[PDB]
Design a binder for this molecule. Structure first.
Ligand SMILES: Nc1ncnc2c1ncn2[C@@H]1O[C@H](COP(=O)(O)OP(=O)(O)OP(=O)(O)O)[C@@H](O)[C@H]1O
Ligand SMILES: Nc1ncnc2c1ncn2[C@@H]1O[C@H](COP(=O)(O)OP(=O)(O)O)[C@@H](O)[C@H]1O
Ligand SMILES: Nc1ncnc2c1ncn2[C@@H]1O[C@H](COP(=O)(O)OP(=O)(O)O)[C@@H](O)[C@H]1O
Ligand SMILES: [Mg+2]
Ligand SMILES: [Mg+2]
Ligand SMILES: [Mg+2]
Ligand SMILES: [Zn+2]
Lengths: 607, 594, 594
């Protein structure tokens, strides 16, 4: 419909004649400067913002959007023409390829009409690469929404990297030398595989009919850094009644090694088909990557925050269908806000919930998983793995900067117990399938839930007697709540009355405070994460006083209540976490004392 | 050899536009496309019978002749949308027509879908079993030739094949953005398992979905599809091209006859107090004793009421019963009673269905090496019943997946990069003899079988039946056994047995089946009086829990809620009666306290 | 496999439309199309050099690739006409482009038309020999299918094949009105016979004419046609497709060199009065005597000037001379002189040209049984000269056909249902021996041969030469003959004769041939003095008619006028002269009086 030569002119006009008032308003031909860098091998990639083209030709940006593979080659050939102009120094022949390119160019210039076959491919006149950066107008597209209609277009997405292969050299322009003639042969490659050439099409051997057999040479050929990765739907975009959906992404050039599993990245690139037949061909798709970037209210809200029972109301909003466990519901809220990590300190507040079956453990975890921004649910894979050769982060990795709810914690694999032990220690996961201790960042609060062996809990049987989990591993947890279903006819009647209401109403009974919508709760959390409250040194005196007091009670306590410095460290996390709930950047005695109260109650739960 | 004008297609295209031109008339279809424009979809839905009303002839032509008539209709649709809005029409390459309404004889089932309907519209009804992955299918590939500076096209439509070189052998580089691609998925339908004679073989019909119709279906969905049945190029494989798919509710309705409804109403109104026990005695008349079990089994068929909450909590109405007992007790016999009686039940063994097993599975086709997400037995029993025998011999992966479906009624799967989440809400009636026979009444039932201490929690009820060697009890059983054995039909001379068939107070099983089918639709609700009463009993069980079967827990409370709900359904009483809670409480007491 | 866009065709069409968009410029082509629209024709004419001037690249593109570029051009022309007037464009299915102007290498002759020019534009200049009948060629046939109620089309263009059945074998009826037909004629061109070597062979090129180009040509016309030289489907046959035709003037001009003009003017101004007599002596110096005959032969070559009146008359300027004499007289040698001497001459026997004969004839092809109008020897001599030997042996049909050309100068033929009226204006020099030799000066000139006296009336002059046995005269001739025998070239040794090669005062034949050609351009007009003088001479000859060759009549008067006109050409006088008439009068008196 349109003349690509005319488009080639427009880009050449744009690149040569686009500038931006840089820092201190410096009128600078931004791309013009980059071309000069490219001319002297000082750059390799040339990322291009389409909004710059939108600044003077939004229609061109639209045509780039409706088809991107075409315009990439147009720009690349457009830059190919411009670069010889901007050359101003004969820089050193960096790597054999440039001097090889120089050698070929002299040979070609030594030649006058010529058949199209006897000419070098554009892809070999390279060692520069070009990528686009999507316009801010184009809103990011969910991986689900990338349908077949959007193939061939340029799309921006968000997601979580589930896996990424090692860097490897992808061939681009296979080069061959004839057996018995000096003519060199080329073969650009698009498919992931190909048949290598055999017989040279060289004019001399073709005329001579000598059967000059091509022999591949890597030095003549040109490779490119390459990677293969999968990206998963970000948990926020996934509907409740579905699960995350993957998408393959291909990365090459300087975009390689800018991503790890469990990185919440945003990718701009072309969505295109690949074929490794009914009513037409069926072809698997992928997303050729261009740009990768690793991503990170009303006054009544403020009035609500000012309320003293605000945080208590929010705790009541935690699973209002669940009657009871109020102080536990408070504790879960503390985990959701997390710590501060002042400096570093473990901001995540890991909690374990051991208790008899049928006491809302599993339901609570499901609510927490639905509530947290970055959430994972598992039972025990959980940890990373090396599939076949490619990394694949487990649920623990995917919970980074979030929470991993592990139901059925009692039935974990003992190796995995060691794995989470590493996470609670340094918040990283190490693994070696081939004896290669690959360490992965795992910064994620752990919400464990276990059930005692042999039915309900026996109070006479000590801790680590009703349960068969490592006591040292248990003591690592910030809080550890023992939930017992004691037959208490009054309270039993209360819970039953709560249940019958829900059946007779499909609704919780009316409380003092109605629950808030989960999204609003998350908004409060995101506001709470905005703060990093500090600990005044005066509070330390009282804090330490409380610590030695309770530690004395542990010495007084015949059973070792696991009081330690670990106990003190968590108390710091709880206090500053409460300060975040208070939206105050300085911790307070109320926050400290309340944290001690919950700590005491968790110990009281061991009664 | 280039067509100029088609008078018939011209008129047919015009008539459709006239039909879609619903302005002077009631405006329903004009409003539809206006909603279609607002909703951004590109597939109008059409009631075929309205088309019959406006034009019976054209409607007959449409049903008899599908491919041509729809193409004209799509043309009229695209122009009509262009009339209302040109730019919105220009967004989409094409538009689609959705059929609906009554299809007189074209409404068939996969059993009855003979080859006679080829190239005729068909409204099939059935259950989706196999699903294939979404794939994008090229339709119009666009190529550029820098040598000639020339752009070409190549449609495929119904039709080495991929063009890559100019006729001058110049290279052709494709134009991905310009070209047209569409998502495309294949599934397979089968007759509804309840209404499917065992003598006849399976009659499974393929289906092709494209565009928005791709993902509007999963395995184990009761769906009605309307499409054009077409052959394929070569004894020729035959497939149905979907024009519109709709998921009929799995509840459906108890059609039957009003006589059956009236007989049920008269029978229900006769004696509501004894109807539960009268059914229970007549539920499994061949079996002697186990009266609580028969009462329990009736509640399972009746089923509770699922409660879906504002937060998405989905408290299941299904009830789950496990039978443990010594061999040579009427356990397998009892389930075959359920199979004969249950409105919608599927049998299965410990191993489950071949390959797929109990729950769903991914299956390479091996005719094209193609993945297929294939429904398993558990999913197919959704809003129904599954009868598992040798449940102890269930495999370990099934012992894993059973936790999900028991907890959620929902099997998820991500294997082979196949993300899916299938509805599997199904009351389960498992049976498993004790290991090595001869149950020891000292340890847990887990210790005798090995249910990992969790599935017992998942099961609402668990009934033990041991071969107690009481001579009185044996006399009662043996009296029953010989009485049935000695029986001869009323018309017989104590001579010949039944012929070798080449084909496969007391109430009839079919009458029972129809009755419970009607009762399942009833939606009884709580009463404050019963709600208070049950709370006393549950607390009383907690009080009785002091002595030390599994302890009474909150699982037990909701179990009683479903049982009282079930007994309420038995009498068609839309308000749960204290009798319902009363009978459930004593039944649970028998289950935990012999 | 559907072509979408041709950027090259897109740009090329735009370039033509810009060229045709002649409003910013002088309006020459915009006016032409406006005049074309007023003309109501559909074939614009184009000068190539304008295209070269406005776009040299495009013109080179056109000439090197005639076909595609013209198709773009005709596209632009129709679009441009539609811009000026849509409905007039809608009158015609298409428009056509006529090329014109200079072509360096592509302007060739059938002799020089090499196979290399295939697919190139070529401006072939030559002479038409054969013309086929006008026939309507079908190009696009529309059919209607009542069974399907469907219209189908087909285009033939360059491509038994006439479709008559639908794919379903429904009968098809051809919509004769909607189908496209165009008259289509074929002709053949050859090299101009004057400028062609005797050694080489004919190079006949076939031309195709369509639409207005059909009857813009006749046999025996000197034309140049610009067209696309192409092969034919199958070693192959090649034909030229005409794009524009024009009949150049048959007189042309003697370009030669200015040196020849200067030599002619110098020689003419040397002795203008003696140039007539000097040329006559040097006309046939190998033959002694018959000097008056030589004067007449010179008059025949120069000829007169045609006069055409308000009544459509075409009063001929040509002169026709008959020579009769006993065998072994230089009559045959005279004709060889004229053939070597004349500017545009052609020989022929009493039989005439094979098959076609003297004038034209209709010949079936016998390769396809196709009629062809073949020009004869007389027709090709139009505005030239013909030499007929053995004129007595003319066939009776030719004896009749000679009357029309002698009188009107145009031959007509309506036979074989084929209608034509060709031009054959040609001064004719005929000769015939008397029957049985031995001429007798007692009977008529007719009686010695047999001419019916119509031809003798038609011939302007008749000269009788007899084998008189005068010893003095015979000595003069024989001594002249032996002097020619004894004559040897200056460079020779009296030894060997000339080699047997494969190739074939007194002024030169070539220079004389140049001068008479220049003189032929001259158009001498009448002078009142000479007109008065000749009128007295004619009346004197009428007075001489009292004495008892043919009697003097008005034929003789006009014969004298042409003779004086011919002598006026001989001295290059822009008007006739008393010398001219006086020379004619004595010449005529010598002819009729010995
Ligand atoms: N304190 C409680 N308040 C409200 N509902 C409760 C409470 N305890 C248990 N339930 C109810 O118990 C029902 C079934 O037990 P539940 O799912 O809570 O078990 P669980 O504690 O997750 O057990 P397990 O870890 O052994 O699998 C749930 O529907 C939940 O609503
Ligand atoms: N209470 C009973 N009344 C009648 N028949 C019984 C009873 N208990 C067992 N049976 C007999 O047991 C047989 C079926 O046993 P089955 O259920 O297959 O054993 P299991 O289920 O333990 O493998 C039937 O033929 C039936 O007659
Ligand atoms: N006056 C003449 N001068 C020279 N040669 C003559 C003359 N008359 C006749 N001839 C000779 O006659 C021969 C040609 O005769 P030709 O013209 O063929 O006879 P015809 O024309 O009667 O058949 C020539 O060889 C020529 O030399
Ligand atoms: Mg649980
Ligand atoms: Mg059995
Ligand atoms: Mg002769
Ligand atoms: Zn070679």
């Amino acid at each position: 419909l349109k003349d690509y030569a005319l488009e080639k002119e427009k880009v050449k006009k744009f690149l040569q004649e686009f500038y931006q008032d840089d820092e201190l308003g410096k009128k600078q031909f931004k791309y013009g400067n980059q071309l000069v860098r490219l001319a002297h091998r000082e750059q390799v990639a040339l990322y291009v913002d389409l909004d710059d083209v939108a600044e003077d030709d939004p229609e061109l940006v639209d045509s780039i959007c409706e088809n991107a593979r075409r315009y990439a080659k147009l720009f690349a050939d457009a830059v190919q023409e411009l670069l010889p102009q901007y050359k101003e120094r004969e820089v050193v022949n960096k790597d054999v390829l440039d001097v090889y390119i120089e050698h070929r160019l002299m040979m070609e210039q030594r030649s006058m009409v010529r058949s199209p076959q006897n000419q070098y491919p554009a892809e070999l006149m390279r060692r520069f690469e070009l990528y686009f950066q999507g316009p801010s107008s184009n809103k990011p597209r969910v991986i689900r929404e990338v349908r077949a209609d959007s193939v061939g277009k340029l799309v921006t997405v968000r997601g979580i990297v589930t896996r990424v292969s090692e860097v490897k050299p992808k061939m681009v322009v296979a080069t061959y030398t004839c057996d018995q003639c000096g003519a060199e042969t080329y073969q650009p490659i698009q498919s992931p595989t190909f048949m290598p050439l055999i017989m040279c099409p060289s004019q001399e051997c073709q005329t001579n009919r000598s059967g000059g057999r091509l022999y591949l040479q890597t030095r003549g050929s040109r490779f490119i850094k390459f990677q293969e990765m999968k990206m998963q739907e970000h948990s926020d975009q996934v509907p409740v009644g579905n699960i995350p959906r993957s998408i393959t992404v291909l990365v090459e050039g300087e975009n390689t090694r800018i991503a790890q599993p469990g990185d919440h990245v945003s990718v701009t690139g072309i969505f295109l088909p690949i074929l490794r037949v009914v009513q037409g061909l069926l072809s698997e798709t992928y997303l050729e990557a261009h740009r990768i970037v690793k991503m990170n209210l009303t006054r009544e809200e403020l009035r609500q925050i000012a309320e003293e029972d605000f945080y208590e109301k929010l705790a009541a909003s935690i699973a209002p269908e669940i009657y009871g466990h109020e102080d536990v519901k408070k504790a879960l809220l503390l985990l959701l806000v997390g710590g501060v990590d002042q400096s570093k300190i473990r901001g995540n507040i890991n909690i374990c919930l051991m208790g008899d079956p049928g006491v809302a453990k599993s339901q609570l975890l499901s609510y927490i998983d639905r509530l947290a921004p970055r959430s994972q649910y598992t039972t025990g894979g959980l940890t990373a793995a090396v599939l076949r050769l490619t990394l694949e982060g487990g649920a623990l990795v995917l919970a980074d900067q979030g929470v991993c709810c592990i139901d059925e914690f009692d039935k974990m694999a003992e190796a995995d117990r060691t794995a989470i032990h590493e996470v609670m220690e340094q918040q990283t996961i190490s693994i070696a399938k081939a004896g290669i201790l690959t360490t992965l960042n795992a910064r994620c609060s752990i919400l464990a839930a276990a059930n005692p062996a042999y039915g309900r809990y026996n109070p006479r049987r000590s801790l680590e007697q009703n349960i068969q989990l490592p006591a040292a591993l248990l003591s690592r947890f910030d809080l550890l709540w023992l939930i017992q279903d004691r037959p208490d006819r009054d309270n039993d009647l209360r819970l039953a009355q709560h249940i019958t209401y829900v059946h007779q109403h499909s609704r919780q009974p009316p409380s003092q405070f109605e629950p808030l919508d989960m999204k609003l709760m998350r908004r409060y959390i995101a506001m709470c994460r905005e703060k990093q409250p500090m600990v005044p040194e005066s509070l330390a005196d009282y804090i330490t006083a409380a610590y030695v007091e309770m530690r004395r009670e542990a010495w007084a306590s015949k059973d070792a209540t696991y009081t330690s410095a670990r106990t003190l460290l968590a108390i710091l996390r709880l206090s500053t976490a409460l300060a975040r709930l208070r939206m105050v950047d300085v911790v307070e005695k109320e926050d400290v004392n309340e944290a001690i109260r919950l700590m005491e109650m968790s110990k009281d739960s061991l009664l | 050899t280039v067509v100029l004008d088609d008078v018939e297609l011209r008129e047919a295209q015009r008539d459709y536009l006239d039909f879609l031109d619903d302005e002077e008339d009631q405006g329903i279809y004009q409003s539809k496309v206006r909603e279609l424009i607002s909703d951004n979809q590109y597939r109008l839905i059409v009631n075929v019978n309205d088309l019959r009303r406006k034009n019976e002839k054209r409607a007959n032509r449409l049903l008899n002749n599908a491919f041509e008539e729809l193409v004209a209709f799509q043309r009229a649709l695209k122009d009509f949308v262009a009339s209302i809005d040109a730019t919105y029409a220009k967004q989409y390459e094409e538009f689609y027509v959705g059929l609906e309404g009554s299809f007189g004889s074209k409404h068939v089932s996969p059993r009855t879908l003979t080859s006679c309907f080829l190239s005729c519209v068909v409204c099939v009804e059935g259950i989706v079993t196999k699903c294939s992955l979404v794939r994008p299918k090229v339709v119009r590939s666009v190529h550029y030739c820098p040598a000639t500076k020339k752009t070409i096209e190549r449609r495929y439509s119904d039709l080495s094949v991929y063009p890559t070189k100019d006729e001058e052998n110049n290279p052709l580089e494709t134009e991905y953005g310009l070209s047209v691609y569409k998502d495309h998925q294949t599934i397979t339908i089968q007759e509804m398992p309840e209404k499917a004679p065992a003598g006849q073989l399976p009659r499974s019909v393929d289906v092709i979905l494209d565009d928005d119709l791709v993902d509007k279906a999963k395995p184990g969905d009761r769906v009605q599809v309307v499409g054009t049945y077409r052959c394929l190029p070569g004894t020729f494989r035959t497939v149905l091209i979907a024009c519109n798919v709709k998921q009929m509710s799995k509840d459906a309705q108890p059609s039957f006859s009003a006589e059956d409804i009236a007989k049920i109403k008269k029978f229900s109104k006769t004696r509501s107090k004894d109807i539960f026990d009268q059914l229970a005695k007549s539920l499994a008349p061949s079996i002697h004793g186990h009266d609580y079990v028969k009462k329990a089994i009736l509640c399972l068929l009746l089923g509770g009421v699922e409660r879906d909450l504002e937060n998405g909590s989905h408290i299941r109405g299904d009830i789950n019963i496990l039978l443990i007992g010594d061999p040579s007790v009427a356990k397998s016999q009892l389930l075959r009673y359920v199979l004969c009686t249950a409105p919608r039940a599927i049998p299965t063994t410990g191993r489950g269905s071949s390959g797929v097993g109990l729950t769903a599975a991914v299956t390479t086709d091996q005719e094209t090496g193609e993945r297929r997400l294939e429904a398993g037995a558990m999913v197919l029993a959704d809003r129904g019943v599954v009868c598992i025998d040798e449940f102890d011999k269930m495999s370990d992966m099934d012992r894993t997946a059973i936790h999900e479906v028991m907890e959620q009624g929902r099997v998820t799967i991500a294997k082979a990069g196949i993300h899916a989440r299938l509805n599997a809400r199904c009351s389960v009636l498992a049976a498993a003899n004790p290991v090595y026979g001869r149950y020891d009444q000292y340890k847990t039932p887990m210790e005798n079988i090995g249910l990992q201490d969790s599935l017992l929690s998942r099961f609402d009820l668990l009934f033990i039946m041991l071969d107690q060697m009481d001579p009185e009890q044996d006399r009662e059983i043996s009296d029953h056994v010989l009485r049935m054995h000695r029986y001869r039909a009323p018309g017989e001379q104590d001579g010949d047995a039944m012929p070798l068939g080449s084909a496969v107070k007391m109430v009839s099983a079919a009458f029972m089946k129809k009755y419970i089918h009607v009762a399942k639709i009833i939606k009884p609700v709580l009463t404050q009086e019963s709600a208070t009463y049950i709370a006393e009993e549950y607390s009383r069980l907690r009080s009785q829990d002091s002595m030390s079967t599994s302890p009474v827990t909150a699982r037990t409370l909701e179990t009683l809620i479903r049982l009282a709900t079930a007994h309420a359904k038995a009498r068609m009483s839309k308000t749960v009666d204290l009798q319902d809670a009363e009978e459930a409480v004593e039944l649970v007491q028998y289950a935990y306290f012999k």
